[PDB]
């Protein structure tokens, strides 16, 4: 039951550890997965982030939100786990899941 | 101009070649390398998800450091050590003192990929991997370095895995197995898939919110950080497996997986689950170690693993009962023989964490509550022989941890045992008996703590004798109470 | 000198304890308690019995271990007579 | 009995202030506690008898191995500042010399001297990459292992140079198979063959003191003197510019590799067997070393 | 190799030349240098001893805000905001308010000097002066806007001076006089040497000390990191005056010395004076205002300002008398006036704040405690109408504060008047008098906001309209008691 | 009646979320609010009566002067991060290129062309820091002075480039004049004369509007195409390698410099009036620019 | 409409008092006192009179300000009489 | 009389900013200027470390006592202020008076 209803989730995006990354990427899932709801939640040290079965962070928009010039590869600076597979590049990073549960 | 990494990267791992002056398997001898007779044609298309290059690895990763150290020195005033709960501290000290040399090993469990995968992909993001490792070796070994000066038991950061204290013997007999001790492709699976994506997480970020609401932002900080390379290096284990199930190997990859989560699970439920539910105060838990076991194994890992075409390992039902007690069981352990643990066990069983445990864990009352209550009376009455072991606990052969159960109203306990080539083995589960039978030359000739204490190896062949044995130069350095059992006045 | 390891109802632990070649389950029963009853374990009226662990059958009160063939380091259960 | 010290207690009963090296490097190996199982596992496992034999077992002896000293005294962080601001001046050479349009102006055919002798090396580094994390997983002492880590390193930051080079020249020229024919000249051409077949079986030398010998003594001193050295001169009569630059940043490198390596032979050296042990490998591995050097620099000046 | 700076650095700062095609004082006119007529060739002899260059400049100060900042992110989440004590909060408000954009005037001081300084050496350290308040000015405007969705009042980092708000306009009429309205060598005198090696230690690392001790290290780390540069940039002005006093101008030098250390007491007095005695909580007060003065002010500066060859000023007993008295009437000032502030000042006198002022300075009890004992009473049996004005504090013509004195058991109170040009003006001390009387040409002409107020510039003519003049927007905006008034549950 | 706002009210309203640039460059100069008086002292003090003619009154007007923006978008952060990142980057080339003795290796009296034509650039660098420092101050937004800011450190940059190179050329050939002519040359040699006749009326050209497109359109475009780009010409020619490699490195900034400048004139143009302004400076200037430039090359060229 | 400065005695600042032409300094000294006693100074018994700032002469209570010469934003003090 | 005291000082030497300079400094003082007396008060943000006359603080001991590799220009990261003129280079930092009071 508690097991179960907690497994059948196809929940994915990033976990953002404390600091000045986590509103812009909050903001950056809003802006980039429009019509998908993003999902929070704060436990102070770092934030969950989720959307459904894929989530997607571009460079563009992050750089946006974050005020400053941004290179997707130092989201890792502040990038403390993910849920989803991840597929990255220069312009985004996408999490996502092969299967849908 | 630079060119974009897209455009080069493939070049820095075309690596792989066709040996001729010596054979491919003493290039990549399947001891080392766990290749499973797969050719070496067919790891040409290993690709790891979670890309980084020699430019932007210094780079980012001095920036990381920068601001690892920054805090830490912007905040050595803000008096933590003397401030915070002494259950708080103990919680520091576990930590460092289980953790810090781990790491350090984990360097040679990247090595070995490094050195002897098959997939050059793996061999270079195994070089990253090596390079993080020495990172949070180093790092966990300077951060409590400061508090030497405080506080002898912070000696044990670096010298538990020195020891034989007999949690440092149960971290090393689990490093060694799933990370010093197997080929390059073990390592792979056991290590950066099972341990590096699911457990790791509930030490480097569940504890992290915890530290975060005790106020200490120093450790918080810096093991968060800790996880953004775990984040990258974990990514090996993946397109491993997947190379594995597509050449015919589902099952060996499956059984690896198996065995390395539950290894890795009896471990935890001994540093921290205790930490979560107990040392860490009542009002800095962000959530309960059940809860955090729920979000970051069941929810995140779980479903990982599914996605990747794998199952629920056949112990699935067997694992979630366990969350349910077998750390409450673990920590009494640990509280009841804190004198042979290099850190200060706090009981956290006043009547308001009590309320919460219960909370947290309907029926907690009417079994270890049982056992508490015991003990609260004994220290009330000031009965304090009462409150130190005077025998040894009986040893897991496998985890190296006690053989626990269910106290109180519904008492349940069942040790799992094996004769074999002429010895008495005892098991905590029936799975760990079952990771003992896939591979015993791996395990059959280690003797645990009490096995050596029985055979003469431990002289005099007493509970102190076994405490000088286990490393412990002064009464000072042995755990205690945290709170020196002031928390009986509030019962 | 016989070690075994006793598992005492109600406690949450294993543990190893060692006892003597000629004694009888009473006096292993009392052995064990010993690391048990009044520690973690409320004391209560009735006879305490000792069984292999798992095992349905008591050995009686007077055997001894020798008596009983148990094996050093074998694991025995300690519980009061239903 | 007894009170805090002011640092581990195996760095306590020495007069100096322990550094930040001291302090993150020492004696972390607890493998080497227990001769008779180097892992906490059966004696006998298989990793057991892997150690007890190609580390514990080498010929070459001492008793104090963690006592070594990186005469650099590096750590992971300032392993970092160094290399992001070397390769960070690398990166912008790189940069402005394409900006330049520097690869054009290479004399009449040189960028086929670059597909046949030097874009291959990337196999080369790489070899030296795996063997420097071979001898990092077997060293007897973490000060030992970590100048191996960081050399791991070294060893992929010239592959990559390579590999974006490799590509970058590709784009001014390309018809010379660049990028393209590197693993068949590896394997194929007999100018490469020397060095392979060096480098296949130095890669299967697993006692660790004879893969350290073998690698730092022979194998890389042989790279600087008879690889790097000559492709400079090389470059020099091809109107090269950016080459001789990028080589003397690799060459840095090397310099280093070869420091710590000479303190660890005056390290080995204290006990007195040690000096024939070294040298045997020394001249077990040195004609190899010659015949890899000789093929390469035939192949790089003929026609 | 590279070669070390002491071999380069004479050719950095080999800069000066002869002009042919205009004269020198067309190059260097005096109204902008300041140069009183010293010829060119003297200013060679100019040796900034706090040496600087650009390789290392970019680079130190790169690693200094890599600090700062990654403090800052590491600490977001502390919830200082919400739960500082309120007089903390308004502590922030005020300093980033009358802070921000006069960081970024200094970048004109120096700009000032880096353009008409004969000497070359002043010239480039002006360069990097330039630079550092930069850096001030843009640190100090991030840092606060975080708050701007917690409370319009952060909104003033940005708006106070662009504001006819009366502190404001004081902060500007101060900063307009020593930085931004005088020639390049008054400023290298009255700014750097005068202001920045003596009283800005009081705000940037006075402070500091009990930001530390308020748990707020943000911001503890953010100027205590900034004072630093000042460190080194406020070295331009000692060598400035020994040139001055060896060619002959030392009586000049001494005057301009004597008035800014005035003009800076007195705005110190209105700024920092409340903020560790009063809103500061108890708790957190390092050392009393006086205590830090004696430290900072008597016992660092005056020092150094005598081993230059300069005198004590000669208004020094005045000096100490008013360290003991000032602040505490300016307190009061701006707690009754709290609506024309934008923070919200803490009236800082609790039973056991009171014992603290007894103890940090005898007396306070029967001459300020009088008028607190008043309001205390009136807040007490709710007379609110009592504890804010209806009419205009008298302000000065100089510093534009409020004319005050020693209320209670031995009322004394002073205004120096003067009449000039067919004007009355009001001054606050003998020494402000003084300062007018120095350079009228600089003042005569400037309405405080009392003169404004009486000449029809502030419509309608009521406290209300000179609260809208003042630019405040919403009630919100207004200043307010810190704990709207629970501390009188403690009396 | 109102409630807090997520930035400062001048940037309140506009859709965009506030940028790093925004929060802590836009509009800081109160001293633009009062057009009677600039500075919080007498209406006619004499710094107001400074402002009110130099800057208040300049012919070159603009209702919105705040609105400029920096195409870069620098702040002190970024600046400083990319300027360590090309600062360490031509430190590095000193470094290896004195390695290597770079400097014995020019043709034969090439230190007598860079005694005479360059080390004396560290006045005319000194000079475009203080008028760069002139501009900054007169400014009328602050975003424009913060780019003039960054440009005065950029030419002490420069300034500081040529007085470490004048040195250490001085120590390969000490017989040339090297660190001990230069301010007689500028003072005396005729080709230095068109310069220094041109920067100090320039630097007497107190309207902020004229001082910056004299500055900026006129002098600096000159110092770039006709000093600069034929300095790098003649290394070619004489063997040396770094100072053309120094000198774009230099490019770099003043192609910076020159980025900014066109933007604040676009933002200018918005006016009708001001293009009529902006080029009459242009031509009353370009005379003594192009006299300059003249006696500058022919001073480089000649024997 | 006359503006003065005053200062009331044992109070700790000056204020500026809108009086009136026409005023006796004992209606000046109530005016001031409004913005003064109960709010900062206590109340007390006795005749308030008004003084040119510092000086030791005090203006006769039934003087009027124009009666008494005194300029526009002079300063006044409020005192007791002795 | 206190203000007096207060003046008739000859202490000399930095004022340290919390971080990993503090200790360092001070034994680097206590080291280098051997039979002077080192005072130091903490207030917590910053160590005012003092002599009398003078005090010299020297790279290589600063480096031993930090640990790490240390150039003199970079104590200015946390070196906040000091009392005393002050002479700096490559080798050491010296703060001193010219006079005695
Ligand atoms: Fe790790
Ligand atoms: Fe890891
Ligand atoms: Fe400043
Ligand atoms: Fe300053």
Same mark, same amino acid.
């Given at each position: 039951?508690?097991?179960?209803?907690?497994?059948?989730?196809?929940?994915?995006?990033?976990?953002?550890?404390?600091?000045?990354?986590?509103?812009?990427?909050?903001?950056?899932?809003?802006?980039?997965?429009?019509?998908?709801?993003?999902?929070?939640?704060?436990?102070?040290?770092?934030?969950?982030?989720?959307?459904?079965?894929?989530?997607?962070?571009?460079?563009?928009?992050?750089?946006?939100?974050?005020?400053?010039?941004?290179?997707?590869?130092?989201?890792?600076?502040?990038?403390?786990?993910?849920?989803?597979?991840?597929?990255?590049?220069?312009?985004?990073?996408?999490?996502?899941?092969?299967?849908?549960? | 101009?630079?060119?974009?990494?897209?455009?080069?990267?493939?070049?820095?791992?075309?690596?792989?070649?066709?040996?001729?002056?010596?054979?491919?398997?003493?290039?990549?001898?399947?001891?080392?390398?766990?290749?499973?007779?797969?050719?070496?044609?067919?790891?040409?298309?290993?690709?790891?998800?979670?890309?980084?290059?020699?430019?932007?690895?210094?780079?980012?990763?001095?920036?990381?450091?920068?601001?690892?150290?920054?805090?830490?020195?912007?905040?050595?005033?803000?008096?933590?050590?003397?401030?915070?709960?002494?259950?708080?501290?103990?919680?520091?000290?576990?930590?460092?003192?289980?953790?810090?040399?781990?790491?350090?090993?984990?360097?040679?469990?990247?090595?070995?990929?490094?050195?002897?995968?098959?997939?050059?992909?793996?061999?270079?993001?195994?070089?990253?991997?090596?390079?993080?490792?020495?990172?949070?070796?180093?790092?966990?070994?300077?951060?409590?370095?400061?508090?030497?000066?405080?506080?002898?038991?912070?000696?044990?950061?670096?010298?538990?895995?020195?020891?034989?204290?007999?949690?440092?013997?149960?971290?090393?007999?689990?490093?060694?197995?799933?990370?010093?001790?197997?080929?390059?492709?073990?390592?792979?699976?056991?290590?950066?898939?099972?341990?590096?994506?699911?457990?790791?997480?509930?030490?480097?970020?569940?504890?992290?919110?915890?530290?975060?609401?005790?106020?200490?932002?120093?450790?918080?900080?810096?093991?968060?950080?800790?996880?953004?390379?775990?984040?990258?290096?974990?990514?090996?284990?993946?397109?491993?497996?997947?190379?594995?199930?597509?050449?015919?190997?589902?099952?060996?990859?499956?059984?690896?997986?198996?065995?390395?989560?539950?290894?890795?699970?009896?471990?935890?439920?001994?540093?921290?689950?205790?930490?979560?539910?107990?040392?860490?105060?009542?009002?800095?838990?962000?959530?309960?170690?059940?809860?955090?076991?729920?979000?970051?194994?069941?929810?995140?890992?779980?479903?990982?693993?599914?996605?990747?075409?794998?199952?629920?390992?056949?112990?699935?039902?067997?694992?979630?009962?366990?969350?349910?007690?077998?750390?409450?069981?673990?920590?009494?352990?640990?509280?009841?023989?804190?004198?042979?643990?290099?850190?200060?066990?706090?009981?956290?069983?006043?009547?308001?964490?009590?309320?919460?445990?219960?909370?947290?864990?309907?029926?907690?009352?009417?079994?270890?509550?049982?056992?508490?209550?015991?003990?609260?009376?004994?220290?009330?009455?000031?009965?304090?022989?009462?409150?130190?072991?005077?025998?040894?606990?009986?040893?897991?052969?496998?985890?190296?941890?006690?053989?626990?159960?269910?106290?109180?109203?519904?008492?349940?306990?069942?040790?799992?045992?094996?004769?074999?080539?002429?010895?008495?083995?005892?098991?905590?589960?029936?799975?760990?008996?079952?990771?003992?039978?896939?591979?015993?030359?791996?395990?059959?000739?280690?003797?645990?703590?009490?096995?050596?204490?029985?055979?003469?190896?431990?002289?005099?062949?007493?509970?102190?004798?076994?405490?000088?044995?286990?490393?412990?130069?002064?009464?000072?350095?042995?755990?205690?109470?945290?709170?020196?059992?002031?928390?009986?006045?509030?019962? | 000198?016989?070690?075994?390891?006793?598992?005492?109802?109600?406690?949450?632990?294993?543990?190893?304890?060692?006892?003597?070649?000629?004694?009888?389950?009473?006096?292993?029963?009392?052995?064990?308690?010993?690391?048990?009853?009044?520690?973690?374990?409320?004391?209560?009226?009735?006879?305490?019995?000792?069984?292999?662990?798992?095992?349905?059958?008591?050995?009686?009160?007077?055997?001894?271990?020798?008596?009983?063939?148990?094996?050093?380091?074998?694991?025995?259960?300690?519980?009061?007579?239903? | 009995?007894?009170?805090?010290?002011?640092?581990?207690?195996?760095?306590?009963?020495?007069?100096?202030?322990?550094?930040?090296?001291?302090?993150?490097?020492?004696?972390?190996?607890?493998?080497?506690?227990?001769?008779?199982?180097?892992?906490?596992?059966?004696?006998?496992?298989?990793?057991?008898?892997?150690?007890?034999?190609?580390?514990?077992?080498?010929?070459?002896?001492?008793?104090?191995?963690?006592?070594?000293?990186?005469?650099?005294?590096?750590?992971?962080?300032?392993?970092?500042?160094?290399?992001?601001?070397?390769?960070?001046?690398?990166?912008?050479?790189?940069?402005?010399?394409?900006?330049?349009?520097?690869?054009?102006?290479?004399?009449?055919?040189?960028?086929?001297?670059?597909?046949?002798?030097?874009?291959?090396?990337?196999?080369?580094?790489?070899?030296?990459?795996?063997?420097?994390?071979?001898?990092?997983?077997?060293?007897?002492?973490?000060?030992?292992?970590?100048?191996?880590?960081?050399?791991?390193?070294?060893?992929?930051?010239?592959?990559?140079?390579?590999?974006?080079?490799?590509?970058?020249?590709?784009?001014?020229?390309?018809?010379?198979?660049?990028?393209?024919?590197?693993?068949?000249?590896?394997?194929?051409?007999?100018?490469?063959?020397?060095?392979? #077949?060096?480098?296949? @079986?130095? &890669?299967?030398?697993?006692? =660790?003191?004879?893969?350290?010998?073998? +690698?730092? *003594?022979?194998?890389?001193?042989?790279?600087? #003197?008879?690889?790097? @050295?000559? &492709?400079?001169?090389?470059? =020099?009569?091809?109107?090269?510019?950016? +080459?001789? *630059?990028?080589?003397?940043?690799?060459?840095?490198?090397?310099?280093?590799?070869?420091?710590?390596?000479?303190?660890?032979?005056?390290?080995?050296?204290?006990?007195?067997?040690?000096?024939?042990?070294?040298?045997?490998?020394?001249?077990?591995?040195?004609?190899?070393?010659?015949?890899?050097?000789?093929?390469?620099?035939?192949?790089?000046?003929?026609?």
């Amino acid at each position: 039951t508690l097991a179960d209803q907690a497994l059948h989730n196809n929940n994915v995006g990033p976990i953002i550890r404390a600091g000045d990354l986590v509103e812009p990427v909050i903001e950056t899932a809003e802006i980039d997965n429009p019509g998908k709801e993003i999902t929070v939640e704060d436990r102070r040290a770092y934030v969950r982030i989720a959307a459904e079965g894929e989530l997607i962070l571009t460079r563009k928009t992050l750089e946006e939100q974050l005020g400053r010039p941004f290179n997707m590869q130092e989201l890792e600076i502040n990038l403390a786990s993910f849920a989803g597979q991840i597929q990255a590049d220069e312009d985004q990073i996408r999490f996502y899941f092969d299967k849908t549960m | 101009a630079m060119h974009p990494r897209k455009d080069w990267y493939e070049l820095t791992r075309a690596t792989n070649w066709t040996p001729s002056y010596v054979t491919e398997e003493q290039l990549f001898p399947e001891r080392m390398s766990g290749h499973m007779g797969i050719p070496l044609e067919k790891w040409e298309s290993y690709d790891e998800p979670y890309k980084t290059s020699y430019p932007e690895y210094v780079s980012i990763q001095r920036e990381k450091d920068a601001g690892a150290y920054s805090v830490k020195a912007a905040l050595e005033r803000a008096k933590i050590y003397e401030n915070s709960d002494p259950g708080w501290i103990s919680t520091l000290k576990s930590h460092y003192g289980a953790i810090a040399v781990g790491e350090y090993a984990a360097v040679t469990g990247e090595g070995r990929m490094a050195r002897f995968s098959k997939a050059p992909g793996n061999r270079n993001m195994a070089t990253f991997g090596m390079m993080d490792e020495l990172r949070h070796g180093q790092l966990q070994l300077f951060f409590p370095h400061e508090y030497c000066k405080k506080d002898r038991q912070f000696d044990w950061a670096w010298r538990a895995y020195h020891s034989n204290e007999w949690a440092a013997i149960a971290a090393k007999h689990f490093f060694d197995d799933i990370i010093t001790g197997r080929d390059a492709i073990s390592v792979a699976i056991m290590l950066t898939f099972s341990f590096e994506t699911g457990f790791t997480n509930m030490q480097f970020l569940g504890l992290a919110a915890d530290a975060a609401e005790a106020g200490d932002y120093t450790f918080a900080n810096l093991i968060s950080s800790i996880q953004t390379d775990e984040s990258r290096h974990a990514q090996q284990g993946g397109p491993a497996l997947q190379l594995l199930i597509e050449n015919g190997k589902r099952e060996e990859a499956q059984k690896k997986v198996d065995m390395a989560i539950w290894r890795a699970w009896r471990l935890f439920a001994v540093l921290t689950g205790p930490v979560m539910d107990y040392y860490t105060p009542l009002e800095d838990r962000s959530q309960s170690f059940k809860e955090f076991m729920y979000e970051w194994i069941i929810g995140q890992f779980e479903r990982s693993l599914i996605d990747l075409g794998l199952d629920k390992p056949w112990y699935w039902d067997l694992f979630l009962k366990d969350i349910d007690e077998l750390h409450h069981s673990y920590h009494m352990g640990v509280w009841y023989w804190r004198t042979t643990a290099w850190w200060n066990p706090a009981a956290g069983v006043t009547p308001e964490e009590r309320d919460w445990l219960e909370e947290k864990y309907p029926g907690w009352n009417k079994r270890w509550g049982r056992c508490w209550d015991v003990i609260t009376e004994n220290v009330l009455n000031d009965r304090m022989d009462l409150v130190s072991p005077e025998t040894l606990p009986s040893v897991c052969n496998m985890s190296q941890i006690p053989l626990v159960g269910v106290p109180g109203d519904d008492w349940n306990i069942e040790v799992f045992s094996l004769e074999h080539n002429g010895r008495l083995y005892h098991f905590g589960s029936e799975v760990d008996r079952w990771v003992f039978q896939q591979d015993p030359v791996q395990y059959q000739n280690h003797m645990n703590i009490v096995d050596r204490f029985l055979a003469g190896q431990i002289q005099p062949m007493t509970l102190e004798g076994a405490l000088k044995y286990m490393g412990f130069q002064s009464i000072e350095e042995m755990g205690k109470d945290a709170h020196d059992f002031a928390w009986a006045d509030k019962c | 000198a016989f070690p075994v390891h006793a598992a005492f109802e109600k406690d949450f632990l294993v543990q190893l304890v060692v006892v003597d070649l000629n004694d009888s389950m009473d006096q292993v029963a009392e052995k064990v308690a010993y690391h048990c009853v009044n520690r973690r374990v409320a004391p209560r009226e009735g006879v305490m019995r000792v069984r292999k662990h798992r095992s349905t059958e008591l050995f009686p009160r007077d055997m001894t271990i020798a008596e009983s063939g148990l094996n050093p380091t074998e694991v025995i259960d300690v519980v009061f007579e239903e | 009995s007894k009170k805090p010290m002011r640092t581990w207690s195996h760095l306590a009963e020495m007069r100096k202030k322990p550094s930040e090296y001291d302090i993150v490097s020492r004696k972390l190996h607890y493998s080497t506690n227990n001769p008779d199982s180097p892992w906490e596992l059966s004696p006998d496992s298989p990793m057991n008898l892997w150690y007890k034999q190609y580390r514990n077992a080498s010929p070459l002896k001492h008793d104090n191995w963690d006592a070594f000293t990186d005469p650099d005294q590096l750590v992971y962080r300032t392993y970092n500042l160094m290399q992001d601001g070397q390769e960070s001046y690398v990166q912008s050479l790189f940069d402005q010399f394409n900006e330049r349009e520097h690869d054009q102006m290479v004399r009449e055919g040189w960028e086929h001297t670059m597909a046949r002798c030097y874009s291959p090396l990337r196999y080369l580094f790489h070899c030296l990459q795996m063997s420097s994390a071979y001898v990092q997983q077997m060293a007897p002492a973490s000060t030992i292992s970590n100048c191996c880590i960081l050399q791991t390193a070294d060893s992929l930051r010239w592959l990559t140079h390579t590999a974006y080079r490799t590509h970058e020249l590709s784009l001014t020229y390309p018809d010379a198979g660049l990028g393209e024919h590197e693993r068949e000249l590896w394997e194929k051409e007999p100018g490469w063959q020397g060095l392979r #077949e060096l480098m296949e @079986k130095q &890669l299967t030398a697993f006692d =660790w003191g004879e893969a350290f010998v073998s +690698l730092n *003594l022979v194998v890389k001193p042989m790279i600087v #003197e008879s690889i790097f @050295k000559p &492709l400079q001169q090389q470059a =020099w009569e091809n109107n090269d510019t950016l +080459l001789p *630059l990028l080589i003397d940043s690799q060459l840095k490198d090397a310099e280093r590799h070869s420091r710590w390596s000479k303190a660890l032979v005056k390290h080995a050296l204290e006990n007195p067997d040690n000096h024939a042990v070294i040298e045997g490998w020394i001249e077990k591995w040195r004609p190899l070393a010659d015949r890899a050097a000789e093929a390469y620099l035939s192949m790089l000046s003929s026609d």
